[PDB]
Ligand SMILES: CC(C)(C)C1=NN(c2nc3ccc(Cl)cc3s2)C(=O)C1
């Protein structure tokens with residue numbers, strides 16, 4: 001019938017914020033279940049709308065100027081359509097390298113802005129997602145033998161894709177370079193740690209993860225997470241205390257390697273304050289069951305593994321005993337999580353849309369742009385009419401009437417304040433001095449100046 005496939009992908013963007021910065025380029029290729037390429041590379045650009053200037057640092061990294069994306073790209077509506085078409089092919093595992101924390105948020109935001117369901121793509125038609133970054137971290141932590149693990153310039157293990165490829169003799173340039181490097185990482189771990197690879201892949205599924213969670217017993221688990229830090233191989237033992245009171249997919253864990261005294265001694269208001277500035281640190285963290293967290297039974301990390309990572313196993317066991325004897329900590333941590341921006345681009349997580357609103361937004365999607373002004377349609381959620389105006393003005397500006405044109409002009413004036421444009425110019429001048437010896441970067445910075453001069 002339909003074959004299971006992987007769709008490896010990567011974005012280049014114009015900045016670090018997945019909602020407020022705009023995408024520049026999307027790259028993807030599909031493989032079979034054994035990581036052999038199927039079909040052709042998909043690479044395309046996104047034209048940025050005229051209400052945005054790129055972050056100069058992002059352009060220095062990607063080498064993609066706003067002029068290039070504008071001249072070679074389609075509008076974000078069309079960009080979104082192409083990506084949505086790829087991501088909704090049945091039985092696809094959509095994956096990348098740091099996609100769970102970055103690329104997937106870019107995707108959610110692109111879909112949100114352009115009237116696609118931000119979530120359905122990842123689970124409908126037997127689809128799933130995965131991320132090779134925490135696979136590499138898990139391999140280093142749990143089963144490192146066979147792979148060369150590079151250090152960064154601070155002397156800690158690095159999981160930068162370019163460091164891992166070089167360290168392991170993998171060729172890594174080409175818009176497809178990061179995608180091909182990600183495929184190489186997948187092959188590396190599958191070949192060299194086959195049982196761990198299979199375990200991690202199987203446990204991408206929320207139900208397999210949920211089966212590991214035993215809140216009444218505070219059953220300990222090994223967890224590998226970038227939040228723990230490279231200095232301990234991104235690893236600790238954790239115990240589940242309670243599920244999040246609002247977020248259906250988040251469990252509240254305690255880091256057993258931490259100091260649990262604040263949890264025993266302080267009240268939830270105090271605990272909440274410390275947790276959100278980031279004097280002992282509050283050893284609580286959320287694990288999101290749909291974000292392919294790395295979790296395994298506690299004995300997966302053996303004493304000799306803990307020793308290698310510098311983790312104090314007996315301290316963790318001691319803390320687990322104390323927590324089990326203090327079940328009032330559960331209500332405390334729940335109370336912590338029981339508990340600003342007027343830019344609709346920043347409002348993806350203000351709430352889920354109702355079925356009625358989703359049905360209305362589908363009509364918007366399936367209507368010709370020229371016919372949108374006459375569309376007799378109503379929305380409940382207050383984000384949607386704002387999303388719709390921006391959608392039309394950014395993508396289909398020739399369909400705006402005089403009044404709408406004036407509204408868009410005002411929008412642009414509020415973005416391009418004299419203080420914003422001055423700071424932008426100042427940043428460019430600073431970077432040209434910093435990179436004066438790198439003539440290609442100097443050329444990129446000059447391109448950014450020229451674009452700002454035009455778009456203003
Ligand atoms: C002896 C062997 C197999 C390594 C085991 N280690 N182990 C556990 N190690 C830890 C380490 C930390 C914690 Cl919090 C719980 C456990 S349970 C077992 O239950 C059995």
Ligand SMILES: [Mg+2]
Pocket residue numbers: 010011097098178
């Ligand atoms: Mg990337």
